[PDB]
Ligand binder design. Structure first.
Ligand SMILES: [Ca+2]
Ligand SMILES: [Ca+2]
Ligand SMILES: [Ca+2]
Ligand SMILES: [Ca+2]
Ligand SMILES: [Mn+2]
Ligand SMILES: [Mn+2]
Ligand SMILES: [Mn+2]
Ligand SMILES: [Mn+2]
Lengths: 6, 237, 237, 237, 237, 6, 6, 6
């Protein structure tokens, strides 16, 4: 899950 | 192999190995893929403080990370450490950088472990506190690129003279004396750890992080554990 | 009225008010009817030790009671004390006897409270330890029949010269200074308490028990709280 | 009258009452005229730290005052406190200003007292630590112009809104609970105190000072003890 | 050679090497011939407690030995340890028997060392406490005939199965981690040690004693240091 | 619940 | 003794 | 000095 770094 | 239990302050999101897409704090039990994570609003250039706590009664490893004037971040995990770690262990701090970098500076570190037996007034304890480090810190086992004495601080990863964090660096510091975390006659066992750190990077994407860990007394930096592996794990499984 | 949070070492089973049918340890939150109980293999005439622990992160009040050479008894309860007790409180010990009796002797008592703020190196703390009590213990507030100095011990309930526990007795001892358990800037708050006691009775059915409690600073023994009410509650609701 | 034992951080030289002609630290035993003094290189505007220590074996009250990056100042005095102070006392901090002024700000204060008896594992102890003060600090007795909460600090003397120290001011702060310094069965008795302060003045001659003191539990600010008398003594005898 | 600083609990009077003609406690600085001694009313078969204290300000090594219900014995010596011991040391306990014998049993041992620098809130510390020993005590370096685990105790000298102390025995126990006793930035340095022991002998003249010592980290039992030499000194000079 | 004292 | 303030 | 053992 997740993929937008910061 | 090495038994690792760590609270990671992960500054770089490696989404392909399970990292959420943002800096975060997590609890790792033998795997870099945290069993539990919390969003961490990391502040490049600011000195932070992490508190790690656990006791054999509640069987919950918790961590609280905060920066002055900001709301803290917390993460907990119900785990019986007696079923994961050996009777005797060593505690330490680890850090690394890979293609990206940051300084992994420790200003102070304290640890307290207590074992209370079923006897009247019987308590076995160990407590150490470092508020300043020396170039020759005999009570610490330095591994990798970790060094002490640079302005009384502990630099877990390589920093050049001009104060620039080097990449592909890994270093660990373990307290010299083994720590007894389990005893047959203990009715309550507990430990608390605290450390202040200064993560600083000239880039917008610092990596890779700092981790407080507990391992078998004979733990060494796994080969190729730079970068995302935080100097703790041999692979990303 | 008085806000009470107590860990009771209940020696007498008053099944009509919720007590299991055996001596037991329980967690009372504003009511004598424990929210949680554990079987306690109480030993008439032996010196025991109770450890009470809690922290604002896990929000779990736990207690462990043990006797030398025996297996301990434990009871836990998930409760956020911030939602039950005021910012400032007083901690103490209470005991009573009714139609049945026992001695409620305290040999030692220690308490530690810590509040860690979001600042670097900022920790507010209080710790007291009594290993011997004096006839004039100025740092203790004695209530009811409690007295100090009898062989350096604290007698919570009346004991005659010949060492015989009197019935219908109630007494409490509170530490003189208020204790700050909550602060707006605290990220971790915690307390630990420990005390050794000697419950002794010439009968096969001793009563009524000893309780470590936390209350509003101005707490006083409720009228008619002898016996089963442990000097803490005004009624059995 | 009030029995006073104090370690003074005297910023103003009142040569007519025995003060050496320079800011200094001294040990006062019932008199403002220090039994022993040491030169103190006081730094207007800098945060300093004072450590006070004593034990019943060596019978020597010592004090060490330091500022970061500077050499410390020390002063010692062989005195048996058992022959000067009562069994039960109260510890606190006091400060004043007269015709000249300065801020007498306390950032943190810690105190530890231990009494070890001739028994196995018997130690009576008290320890408190304030790293931040609240507007409602119930465990402190404020006297005179002392106030708490102003940026989490303790202001012993009046400071106006614009941060200006007022003259002819006197204030004291005592820990709420009495402290037991002597017990008949004690074989070793000792105490350690530590506090960080910030003395600041817009003038080239700040006055009058800060003092850590130990007195009878019922001590109050003597009338007219502003200025050179540091809120401790009624006269200069 | 090995730098030794020890507080000896000498049970046997070897008048030919300077021992007073009675059991006594003494302070040894690199020589078995104590620089200072005090009469010790040793009690065969009773559990005693020794407290050792020192701080860099007063520069006085003191020791207090007591038995329950008896008057204690004390001995002090003004000595600047910075001028005798290296920066890093190891602390331990030593014991021996020769032609005469006794058991040299340690029930508990605690040690605390603190170094306070000229910085705000900077304190380096180490504290360990053993209330029970295990057969495999990894944080202790056992030398000679010393063994652990026998009823949770530390036997410094050989004891046969039937509980009989063997003669010509020598053993030492050192804490695993080196101890930092001096730092360039320290303004106050101090240590406190405490241990409970049980000296028992079937004879009217037990020998030879127990000593708490501080030595260079690499200290080993000198050859032929049995008996009167307490496992600390190579000769009686 | 319960009713057998000790 | 003394008389030169600071 | 001394010579009477205990
Ligand atoms: Ca990562
Ligand atoms: Ca009951
Ligand atoms: Ca003055
Ligand atoms: Ca001898
Ligand atoms: Mn991660
Ligand atoms: Mn009950
Ligand atoms: Mn003065
Ligand atoms: Mn000797």
């Amino acid at each position: 899950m997740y993929w937008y770094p910061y | 192999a090495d038994t690792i239990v760590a609270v990671e302050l992960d500054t770089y999101p490696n989404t392909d190995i399970g990292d959420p897409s943002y800096p975060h704090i997590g609890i790792d039990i033998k795997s870099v893929r945290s069993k539990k994570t919390a969003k961490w609003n990391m502040q490049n250039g600011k000195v932070g403080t992490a508190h790690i706590i656990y006791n054999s009664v509640d069987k919950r490893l918790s961590a609280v990370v905060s920066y002055p004037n900001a709301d803290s971040a917390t993460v907990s995990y119900d785990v019986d450490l007696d079923n994961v770690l050996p009777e005797w262990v060593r505690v330490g701090l680890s850090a690394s950088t890979g293609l990206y970098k940051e300084t992994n500076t420790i200003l102070s570190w304290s640890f307290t472990s207590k074992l209370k037996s079923n006897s009247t007034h019987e308590t076995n304890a160990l407590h150490f506190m470092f508020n300043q480090f020396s170039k020759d810190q005999k009570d610490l086992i330095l591994q990798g690129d970790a060094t002490t004495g640079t302005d009384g601080n502990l630099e877990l990863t390589r920093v050049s003279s001009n104060g620039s964090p080097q990449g592909s660096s890994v270093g660990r510091a373990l307290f010299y004396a083994p720590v007894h975390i389990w005893e047959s006659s203990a009715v309550v066992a507990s430990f608390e750890a605290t450390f202040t750190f200064l993560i600083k990077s000239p880039d917008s994407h610092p990596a890779d992080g700092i981790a407080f860990f507990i391992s078998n007394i004979d733990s060494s930096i796994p080969s190729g554990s730079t970068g995302r592996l935080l100097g703790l794990f041999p692979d990303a499984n």
